[PDB]
From Swiss-Prot:
GO terms for biological process: translation. It holds the Pfam family Ribosomal_S5. This is Small ribosomal subunit protein uS5. Keywords: Ribonucleoprotein, Ribosomal protein, RNA-binding, rRNA-binding. The keyword Transmembrane does not apply. Gene3D superfamilies: 3.30.160.20, 3.30.230.10. The keyword rRNA-binding applies. Transmembrane segments: none annotated.
Length: 148
RNA sequence: UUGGAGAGUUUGAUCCUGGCUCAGGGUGAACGCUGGCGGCGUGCCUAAGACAUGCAAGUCGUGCGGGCCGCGGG
């Protein structure tokens, strides 16, 4: 099975005659603390169903992060819309230096040592995907020679 | 490569822009409430305004000639 963290659970609403009607949205990261993470965002008429749906999509969307002593191989910068995430290799003592959103992702991914920074829009959702696509572009010394 | 966390607040809700705000470290500090001990620091940031009183630069008789006192004695 997988380890699971709720990053964001927010209420939205829409208007109608007679009043606002709500809906809930569930940002969930899911991982094995050993190189496999998934991000899922899920909506439903109620809180828990949404969390459940969220967790579901998460598994249906994964990425294999190439750890190396608990740190990523190389520097990576990624922009998703106006959001930017910076990922930077750190040595053993460092810890994970990051805000909650990319923290939850990197920890449950088994990253244990990394320097990060959020730039631009720090909307959680967008920072979330931006951290994902970031990880998803990581390449290994091998990966590269093999390509070239 | 010893190194990099962010949050609140514009909307019915969203994304973005954008300012305000906060958490951190610092000080010749000051103010309040409170206050036992020791060590190293450290203390007129304002009127280079004004200052009573003592003290902060003198020494050599192995450069010189004198007075005053005394010690030694003709
Ligand atoms: Mg790979
Ligand atoms: Mg963005
Ligand atoms: Mg851009
Ligand atoms: Mg390295
Ligand atoms: Mg914000
Ligand atoms: Mg308001
Ligand atoms: Mg407006
Ligand atoms: Mg409101
Ligand atoms: Mg802001
Ligand atoms: Mg006091
Ligand atoms: Mg007192
Ligand atoms: Mg002065
Ligand atoms: Mg005056
Ligand atoms: Mg005066
Ligand atoms: Mg004296
Ligand atoms: Mg002489």
């Amino acid at each position: 099975d997988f380890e699971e963290k709720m990053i964001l659970i927010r209420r939205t609403a829409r208007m109608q005659a007679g009043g606002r009607r709500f809906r809930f949205g569930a940002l969930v990261v899911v991982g094995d603390r050993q190189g496999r993470v998934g991000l899922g965002f899920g909506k439903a008429p109620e809180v828990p169903l949404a969390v459940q749906k969220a967790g579901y999509y998460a598994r249906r969307n994964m990425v294999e992060v190439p750890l190396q002593n608990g740190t990523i191989p190389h520097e990576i910068e990624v922009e998703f819309g106006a959001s930017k995430i910076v990922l930077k290799p750190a040595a053993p003592g460092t810890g994970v230096i990051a805000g909650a959103v990319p923290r939850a992702i990197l920890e449950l991914a088994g990253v244990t040592d990394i320097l990060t920074k959020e730039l631009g829009s720090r909307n959680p959702i967008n920072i979330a995907y931006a951290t994902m696509e970031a990880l998803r572009q990581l390449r290994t010394k091998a990966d590269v020679e093999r390509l070239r």
